[PDB]
Chain length 493, copies 3
C-alpha cells in the first residue's frame, strides 16, 4: 500500500503548468489506487477558499488532499484551547479608544486621537476581510489581518515600512507560529513555533521537522519534489527508508545566458541525483543533455500525464490564431507581436488571441498600440476554461524560447488544433511532425513563422488535416498506461 | 459694492517689498471704499502678535483684515467646545512623573526618570513661550509648543529628528487640524481637518476648499494673487462669477540663467493668463516682453501705488551712500562691495550704509573685512523706519540684477535722494532720467558706477538738484489717481 | 609628604607593558614612602573582580589603590539611599508578564507574549552575570546588564542596533550617571551625573571635575599621565600648585609612515611640555629626537623601574626560540614568521614559541599553516607567568618595528636569556651589546637575523655566556636606586 506526497511551495488559482501537472498526476495515481497528495510550505489565510475554488473548476481532483506546514501547527493550537482569545481582541479594541474617524473610500477609514490628534490606525473593511494598520510616531508599526471578523495574522513593520516579523493566530485567536522576515529580500529567518515552545533556524529547518513528522519512514512512503526550491526540504529529511524523487519541469540551462551556465536550483537537484531515488525529466532529449554534462546516472524520463478530453465539435473556419500561456519573458510574446505585424501586413483579416497574465502583460499591451494592431491582437486575460477558448482558434502558436515539455501546445493538439512553434529545448521537436500535424520553425526565424502562419490560416483543409493528425499523435506517444508504468517501475526497486 | 481678497502665503515683519506693496494697495482700495483684505495659507501661533506689530509700525493699515485658513478652522473648533482640554494637559503632566531635573541655561532644563535613568524630556521656558521635547530611546519623538502656558501645536519627529507630522490645537486645547509633512523637503501632504472630520490631499486641496467657503461667488468678489506659489490655490477654485487676477512682482525670467529659461511659477501664471480675468505686471517693458515670448493677451501693466510721504527737511551734506534691500543674491551687494572699494581707493572720506538682512549678509560681512573697508562700509541691519534712514544719505545706489519695479529706489527718489543704478529689467529705466534725477549705469560696469558715485558724492549742488527732480518725476508718472483708475477698469468689465 | 596619582584610561588583565610599567612604578614609590595610586576613567561593572585578579597574580601590588570616576559617583549614590530600588526590578518584572519562554542554548531563552506573539525579551544567564535584551517592533531597544542578580548598567540601542545611551546603577539599584554615546564612533558625549543633578559636555569635562575633586591642590600632590588619551583630563585641571607630568611610553613618530608625521596624541603632549612640570621619555635617544624636532625643553629621560627577579636554575639546552608580546602590527610577527621559515629550512630541529594575544593573532596562525611550520612554530596564547615561560627558551627574538624601550627584551635579559633583535627606535641599541649579550640585527634584514639565530641556537656555550652578560648589563645600567633618584629630582624643584 504505497502513499505519495508531492512537494510544492504553494498552490493558487492563477498558476501555470507545474500545478496543472501535479493535479493531473494526483488524479492519475488515485485512479491507480495510490493516494497522491500535495504538501505546501507557505502561509495563506484563505487556503480553504482556494482549494474549494480549484476543486469547483475541476482543476484539482476532489480526492487530492493538501497538507500544509502552518495548518498542521494551527491544528495543534486549535485543540490546545477551548475559550476564545478575548484578550487579543480587547488589546486591539483598547488601542482604538478616544478616537475620531475620518472616511476615505468605502471601507477605508483613518482614526485619530480625540485628545491628542495622533494618527492611531487605518482600517479597510471588505465584506469578509478587514485590515487594521496601527501607527507609532506617524509611521506604520503593525497590521492586523482578519478573515470573517477573526484575526489570523499580524505583521510588524520597520522604518522603511517593510515586514520584518509575522505572527499567525489559530481559529480561536491564539498565536501558534511567529517568525522573523528579512525586510530587504523578504526571506524567512528564525521561525518560532509558539505552541510547542520550539525555535527553528528558518523555514527549511521547520519544514524538514514537519515532513519528518508528516511522512512515515516506510518504503511504501514516496516523496516527489516538483518545486525546485522545495528540494532541500525533501533532501534534508532523516528518512532512511522513504523514497525521494525530484521532478525537473524546466530547461535546466540558465535563461538568457550564452556562457553555458545552469539554473542554480536545478544544478543542485541534478548534482545530487545519485544521492536520492531519482531525478525525473520530461523529454528524452533533456535526459541525454543532463547525462552528457554531469557525472550522475539517476536521471529518468517520464512525461506528464495527458488529460485526453474530447475534441471540439467543429473546427474554426475564421482566421483566429491562439496563444494560452503565463505571460513571462521566456514565453517571448514580444516575438509573437513582431510575427503578428508581419502576418497582418500581408493579410488584414487574421486575429490573434493572447490568453493569460504575468510580468510582460503591460509591455506587450503597450507594444500592440505602437505597432497599430489594436484591431488585430487582443489580450484576453487569464482563462479558467482553456479547453473552451481552444474551440475558437484555427491554429495555435509558440514563440517560447525555453521549455520543459510545453503542455499548452500538447493541449491544443489534443483539441484538434495544429501548432506552429520554434524548434527549441525541450518538447516541440518531440510531439510536432513538421508538415504533418504542425510546423516546426527554426528558432527566432520570425519571418518564416509568419509565412507558415499565413499558409495555414488561409487553407482551411490543412488546418483541419493537421489538427486531426495532432490529436492522433498525442494519444499514440503519450498513453496514460505507459507513463504510469514508468513511475511504478521506480517505486518498485 | 466690490470686496477684494489679496492672496499671499504668509505675513511677517522682516518681509520685503511684496508685502509693503500689498499693504499700500490695501490702504488705497479702502480709501476708494473697496475693502481689500489679506488671505494667508500658513500656520503661525503668534499671528495676532505679528498683526499688532505690523499695524503699530504703520506698515499695515488698521482697516485691513487678515483671513487665515488655520484660524478659520481654529474658530470653528473654539465654538465646538466649552470646557478646557484638561485631558491633554494631564497627558503631558503624566509623561513627566517620577522625574529629576537637570539645568542647562536659564529656561533650559532636561528631565530624567528617577527610577530608570531614561532621558524623558527637554523644556525651554521663555516668559510667554515654552517648548517641551519628549524622547523615546534617547531620540526626540515630539515637541509640544506653548504660548502663554497654553499648547497650540505638536510636531512629531522621525529617526533623522525631522518633522513628519503636525497637530494644531484651538484656544481650548482641542486638536482641529493635523497633517503629514514630508520630512525630506518639508512639503505639506495629507491635511486632516479633525473638527469637520474631513481629509484633504494637501494644502492646495485644503485652501481651495477654504477660499470656496470664504469668498462668495459674486461678480463683486475679487481675488488678487500676489504670491506666485499661492496662484494654484486661486486658480483651482470652482468660482464661476468671482474675478481672478494674478500679480507678477518680479522679472519672469529665471535668475542667473543664460539659457533663456523662465521662473517655473511665473511661467504657469503667464501661460494661464487668458483663462483668468488678467495677469498684472509693474512695467510696460515687462508687458511687451511677456507678450512677445508667450501666446497670451490678458497681460496688463499697473504699477505699485506710491506712498508720497513728505521729503526730509535738509539734504545730507556728508559723503554717505545708502542701500535699503533684502540681502539676497539678485540684489548683488557683492558688486556694491567691489564698487565701494573703487570709490574709497579714490576718496577715503565716503561711507556706505547697508540696511537689511538675508541669505548673503554673512558673506558680505566677511567680504568687508578682507577688502579692509570696515571703517567705510557698515551693515546697519534691518530697519523698521526706512524713511528715517533715507534722511541720512547723500545718494542711494542699486547693484540689483533682476527687478520687477524696485520700490526702494522709488522711495529714495520720493525722499529727495538721487539713485545711481544699473540699467536692468525692469524699472530703473522707467523712473530714472540719467543726468537729470539720477544715473543709469550700464549693467555690471562697476568702474563707471564708482566714477558716477564719486561725481555725485563730492558735488553737493548736483546731489540736491537731482534729488529734487527725482521727487518731481515720481509724483508726475506714478499718480495714485491714475493707478487706481487702471484697477477699476479691470474690475468693471 | 608627597602623594602620586597615575592616570590611565583603564586597567585590565590581558594588558601590555604600560600597565606592567605603572604597577612596578607604584610598588617602587610605595617602597620610597610615596603612595602612588592609579586613576581610571572608564566604566566596568566587575572592576573589584579585576583588581582581585591583578593582585593575586602579583602583577599589581596589594598597597596600590585604584581610584575610578564612576566608582566615586556610585559611592556618592550608595550613601544617598537606604532602601533598595525595588521599583526598577518591578519595572523589568512587569515587562515580562504574559510571556512564554523558548530555549536556545543553556542560559539562552527568548520570551514571547502569550496573548499577542510579540518577541518580548532575550535572556542569557551565566552563573553571576545575566543580560536582558528588551525589544520593540522586533528590534532591540535596551539591555539590562546584571552581576550577582543585581542590575548595574542599562544600554539603549538605535535602529542599527548600536548603543547610543548608557545608565549606571549603584549597589542599591539607583541610577547615578547616564550618558549619550555617539553610535557611529562610540564616543562619549553628554554625561549627566544624576546624583548631583549636574550635566557635563563629555567624559573630558566629567573627569576634569573629578580630578579637581579627588586631588588636593598641594605642591605635595603629583599627577603622572601614562595614557596619552588621558593627557587632556590632567592638562585641563584648574590645579595651580599640583605637579603635572606626562610619560611617553612609545615612539612619538606615526607608525608605518614615511611622511615624517607624528602620533596625534604624543605631538600634543610634546608641544605642551613647557606648560607642565615635564614630559618623560624612556630612552636618552628619544629625548634628543624630540628636542631636535620641537621647540620645547621640558623633556626628561627616566627609564622604567626593572623588577630584577631571580634568574632560572638552568639554561635551556633544547633549540627553543621565544617571543612574549602583544600580538599587534608594530611587533611585526609576520617578519618573525618569515625568519622562522629561513631558520627551519636550514635546521629542522628548532622550535618557536609565541606567547600573547591580539589583532594579528589569526593572520599569523593562518600564515603558519601556509608556510608548513605547524610542527615548528606554536602560538602559546597569553601568559600570566612570563617569568616561567622564559625558563623554557634558549634565546628570545624581537622583530618589533617601533618601541618606547621594550620591557619584554629587558625581562628576557634579566632571566639570563640573550636577545636577537632589529636595531630600531627606541631601546634595543641602549641595552643590547652586539656579540656580547645579544645580537643587534639591521632593521628588516630577515636573512641575517635568521643566520644569527642559527648561530646562537646551535652553540650552547654562547647562548649561556650571552645570557649571563645580559643579566649583568641590566643590573648595571637600570639600577632602581638611580631611576628613583631621577624622579625625586623632578618632584623637588
Ligand atoms: O489562460 C490560461 C489558463 C490556463 N493555463 C494553463 O497553464 C498551463 C501552461 O503549461 P506550459 O506547459 O506551457 O508551462 P508553463 O506556462 O508553466 O511554463 C496549461 O495547462 C494551460 O491550460 C494558462 O497558462 N493560461
Ligand atoms: O531695512 C529695510 C526696511 C524696509 N524694507 C522695505 O522693503 C522694500 C523693498 O522693495 P523692493 O522694490 O526693492 O523689492 P524686494 O526687496 O522685495 O525685491 C521697501 O519698501 C523697503 O522700504 C527693506 O527692504 N529693508
Ligand atoms: O604573554 C604575555 C604575558 C605578559 N606580557 C607582558 O607585557 C609586557 C610587554 O612589554 P613591552 O615593553 O614589549 O611593551 P608593549 O607590548 O606594551 O608595547 C611585558 O612586561 C610582558 O611580560 C605580555 O606581553 N605577554
Amino acid at each position: 500500500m504505497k502513499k505519495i506526497f508531492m512537494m510544492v511551495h504553494e498552490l493558487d488559482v492563477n498558476k501555470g503548468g507545474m500545478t496543472s501537472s501535479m493535479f493531473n498526476r494526483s488524479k492519475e495515481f488515485y485512479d491507480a489506487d495510490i493516494p497522491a497528495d500535495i504538501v505546501t510550505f507557505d502561509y495563506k489565510g484563505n487556503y480553504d477558499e482556494i482549494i474549494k475554488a480549484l476543486k469547483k473548476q475541476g482543476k484539482m481532483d476532489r480526492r487530492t488532499k493538501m497538507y500544509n506546514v502552518f495548518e498542521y501547527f494551527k491544528q495543534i493550537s486549535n485543540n490546545k484551547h477551548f475559550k476564545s482569545n478575548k484578550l487579543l481582541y480587547k488589546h486591539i479594541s483598547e488601542r482604538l479608544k478616544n478616537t475620531i474617524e475620518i472616511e476615505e473610500s468605502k471601507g477605508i477609514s483613518r482614526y485619530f486621537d480625540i485628545t491628542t490628534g495622533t494618527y492611531i490606525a487605518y482600517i479597510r473593511k471588505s465584506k469578509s476581510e478587514k485590515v487594521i494598520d496601527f501607527f507609532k510616531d506617524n509611521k506604520r508599526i503593525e497590521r492586523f489581518s482578519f478573515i470573517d471578523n477573526k484575526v489570523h495574522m499580524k505583521e510588524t513593520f520597520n522604518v522603511d515600512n517593510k515586514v520584518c516579523y509575522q505572527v499567525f493566530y489559530d481559529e480561536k485567536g491564539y498565536p501558534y507560529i511567529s517568525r522573523n522576515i528579512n525586510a530587504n529580500n523578504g526571506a524567512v529567518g528564525k521561525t518560532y513555533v509558539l505552541v510547542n515552545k520550539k525555535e527553528f533556524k528558518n523555514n527549511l529547518a521547520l519544514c524538514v521537522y514537519y515532513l519528518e513528522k508528516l511522512i512515515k519512514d516506510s518504503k511504501d512512503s514516496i516523496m516527489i519534489c516538483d518545486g525546485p526550491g522545495s528540494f532541500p526540504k525533501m533532501f534534508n529529511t532523516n528518512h532512511k527508508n522513504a523514497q525521494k524523487y525530484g521532478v525537473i519541469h524546466v530547461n535546466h540551462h540558465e535563461n538568457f545566458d550564452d556562457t553555458g551556465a545552469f539554473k542554480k536550483s536545478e544544478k543542485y537537484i541534478i548534482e545530487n541525483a545519485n544521492k536520492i531515488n531519482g531525478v525525473i525529466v520530461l523529454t528524452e532529449a533533456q535526459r541525454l543533455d543532463i547525462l552528457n554534462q554531469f557525472d550522475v546516472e539517476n536521471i529518468f524520463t517520464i512525461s506528464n500525464f495527458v488529460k485526453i478530453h474530447n475534441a471540439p465539435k467543429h473546427f474554426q473556419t475564421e482566421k483566429i490564431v491562439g496563444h494560452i500561456s503565463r505571460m513571462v519573458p521566456t514565453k517571448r510574446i514580444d516575438l509573437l507581436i513582431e510575427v503578428a505585424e508581419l502576418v497582418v501586413k500581408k493579410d488584414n483579416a487574421v486575429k490573434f488571441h493572447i490568453y493569460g497574465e504575468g510580468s510582460v502583460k503591460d509591455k506587450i499591451a503597450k507594444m500592440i498600440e505602437d505597432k497599430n494592431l489594436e484591431r488585430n491582437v487582443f489580450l484576453k486575460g487569464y482563462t479558467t476554461t482553456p479547453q473552451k477558448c481552444l474551440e475558437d482558434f484555427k491554429l495555435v502558436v509558440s514563440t517560447s524560447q525555453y521549455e520543459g515539455q510545453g503542455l499548452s501546445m500538447i493541449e491544443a493538439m489534443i483539441s484538434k488544433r495544429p501548432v506552429v512553434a520554434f524548434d527549441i529545448k525541450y518538447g516541440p521537436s518531440d510531439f510536432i511532425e513538421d508538415n504533418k500535424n504542425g510546423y516546426l520553425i527554426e528558432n527566432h526565424n520570425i519571418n518564416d513563422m509568419a509565412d507558415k502562419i499565413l499558409q495555414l490560416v488561409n487553407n482551411d483543409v490543412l488546418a483541419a488535416e493537421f489538427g486531426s493528425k495532432a490529436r492522433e499523435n498525442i494519444i499514440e506517444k503519450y498513453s496514460t498506461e505507459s507513463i504510469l508504468e514508468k513511475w511504478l517501475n521506480l517505486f518498485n526497486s
